[PDB]
């Protein structure tokens, strides 16, 4: 136990466990915890995943059809320090300052995205302790390019739960 926050999630595949910062992004944490607290994850899913590289997720409920997001926070990527396939990170949005409710679980040595150039998009504020495999196995089952959103599990996943540990 010790003391290290972990957004625990049990998708159809199995019970996994994210682990999230806090310090480097107080604001964001508050937001998601709002959602986390309840009414959202209970029966969303995981859109999909680029093979052995990066699973999302949290967004389009089931098939994929916006909940009703848009509680626009602020700066993201510029607060996630170094790491590797294991970290979670927030998506973004056309505008810029937003990322209302949606994150994605990596796996492979990334860094590339590391805000440091004529660019800035993908946030960050977590990781992955245990059920990485689960994620994998999930990211194993075939899929298909949908149309708009490339990479979506034809035979869709369905999340069971999301319970944060102190």
Could you name the CATH topology? Cyclophilin
Count of DSSP strands: 8
Which percent band covers the strand fraction? 15-25%
**Total helical segments:** 2
What is the topology, as strand order, of the major beta sheet?
7-2-1-8
Q: Kindly, what is the distance between the CA atoms of the first and last residues, rounded to a whole number of angstroms?
A: 9 Å
Q: Give the helices and strands as they follow along the chain.
A: EEHEEEEEHE
**What's the CATH first level?**
Mainly Beta
Helix proportion of residues, in percent? 10-25%
What Rg, in angstroms, do the CA atoms define? 15 Å
Choose one word for the global shape.
globular
Main β sheet profile: 4 strands, antiparallel
PDB class: isomerase(peptidyl-prolyl cis-trans)
Keywords: isomerase(peptidyl-prolyl CIS-trans)
Assembly: monomeric
Entry title: three-dimensional solution structure of escherichia coli periplasmic cyclophilin
Keywords:
166 residues, alpha+beta, Cyclophilin, 4-stranded antiparallel beta sheet, two-stranded antiparallel sheet, 2 helices, 11% helix, 19% strand, periplasm, Cyclophilin-type_PPIase_dom, Peptidyl-prolyl cis-trans isomerase A, EC 5.2.1.8
Protein described:
With 166 residues, the protein is α+β, with helices and mostly antiparallel strands. Helices cover 11% and strands 19% of the residues. The strands form 3 sheets. Strands 7-2-1-8 form a 4-stranded antiparallel β-sheet. The protein has a two-stranded antiparallel ribbon with strand order 3-4. A hairpin with a 3-residue loop joins β3 and β4 (54-55).
């Amino acid at each position: 136990a010790k003391g290290d926050p972990h957004v625990l999630l049990t998708t159809s595949a199995g019970n996994i466990e994210l682990e999230l910062d806090k310090q480097k992004a107080p604001v964001s944490v508050q937001n998601f915890v709002d959602y986390v607290n309840s009414g959202f994850y209970n029966n969303t899913t995981f859109h999909r995943v680029i093979p052995g590289f990066m699973i999302q997720g949290g967004g389009f409920t089931e098939q994929m059809q916006q909940k009703k997001p848009n509680p626009p926070i602020k700066n993201e990527a510029d607060n996630g320090l170094r790491n590797t396939r294991g970290t979670i990170a927030m998506a973004r949005t056309a505008d810029k300052d937003s990322a209302t409710s949606q994150f994605f679980i990596n796996v492979a040595d990334n860094a590339f995205l590391d805000h440091g150039q004529r660019d800035f998009g993908y946030a960050v504020f977590g990781k992955v302790v245990k059920g990485m495999d689960v994620a994998d196995k999930i990211s194993q089952v075939p899929t298909h390019d949908v149309g708009p959103y490339q990479n979506v599990p034809s035979k869709p996943v369905v999340i069971l739960s999301a319970k944060v540990l102190p």
